[PDB]
Subunit: 130 residues, 3 copies
Amino acid sequence: KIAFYAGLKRQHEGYEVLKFDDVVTNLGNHYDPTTGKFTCSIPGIYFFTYHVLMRGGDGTSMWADLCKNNQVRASAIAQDADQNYDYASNSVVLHLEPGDEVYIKLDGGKAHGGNNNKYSTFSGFIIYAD
Amino acid sequence: KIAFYAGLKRQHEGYEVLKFDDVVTNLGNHYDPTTGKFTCSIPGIYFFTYHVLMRGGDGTSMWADLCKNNQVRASAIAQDADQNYDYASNSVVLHLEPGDEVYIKLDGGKAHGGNNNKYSTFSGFIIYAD
Amino acid sequence: KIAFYAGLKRQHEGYEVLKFDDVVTNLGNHYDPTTGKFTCSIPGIYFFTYHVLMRGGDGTSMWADLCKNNQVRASAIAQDADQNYDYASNSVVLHLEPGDEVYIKLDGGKAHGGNNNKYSTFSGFIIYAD
């Protein structure tokens, strides 16, 4: 059984892997909140989704991408000229090999740092094992 | 087999459980459109997702949270200074026990009341049984 | 095994089926990038999700709906008075019969044409077989 769901506890900005550290579900401990990475243990087909809230009242654009190893597999942007809250969100279905790392990367701009309110999230689960 | 998908038929505002009453899928009848609640029947791991459209032309912020019993498990905001339509959406993976109730709560602001167009939605399914 | 994920390679506008032609996953080849349609091969219960990015700097509203055959099953709008990027996104769980076609239709407005960056996406997988 492989599934996880975590939220962002702190605010972040710039270009970095987002460490979702408010962990709600983590079957098999394949998601690591100290790195923000899900590491594949079984070859197969996996679903992932993310929702990253842009900071409000400070900035107009924010990008958040889902990556596999060093490669973008989905991109998203939040943008609002009046500096309103808005989301960069996307979903994927990927084939993974053992060792592959899946994570969300901030690619410019500012992310809201909810404490335990889980505004910004990352989840995933295996659909098929090879 | 446990899975459901429903849309909002009427417009709502304030602080209340959203009753998605345009039911498209409801395997096992574990979602109740008269309460807006999914009730767990089997201990296990469940995926849920929601997309709630803020009313356009009347208001600037709207919040919608996914709850388990009396506890927030995901939060979302829609915000636009020019009163444009925008979405409060999120997704989760949760462990549930029989009797647990999962639902979307409006937490301030105004939600669009599509009739049968299914702009605002709530869906879920079991991933694993314990 | 039935699952797929694809992104939009080109920009589109108006009223047309969106052809997600940047195919990442397509188990069983049930998604056709030349038509934009997923065709059901097995009766059962299926999850789909989509995220369509509105073009920035040219227009204020865009609609994108998920359809089954000739019927809307989910609707979404992106809207921003300052012509900012924003998303029309939704998710569904549907019962399908063999031959049923599921696709995303642009229903007015302008969609961003990312090349291989996968800003705009469509994915799905079977949950249950009848």
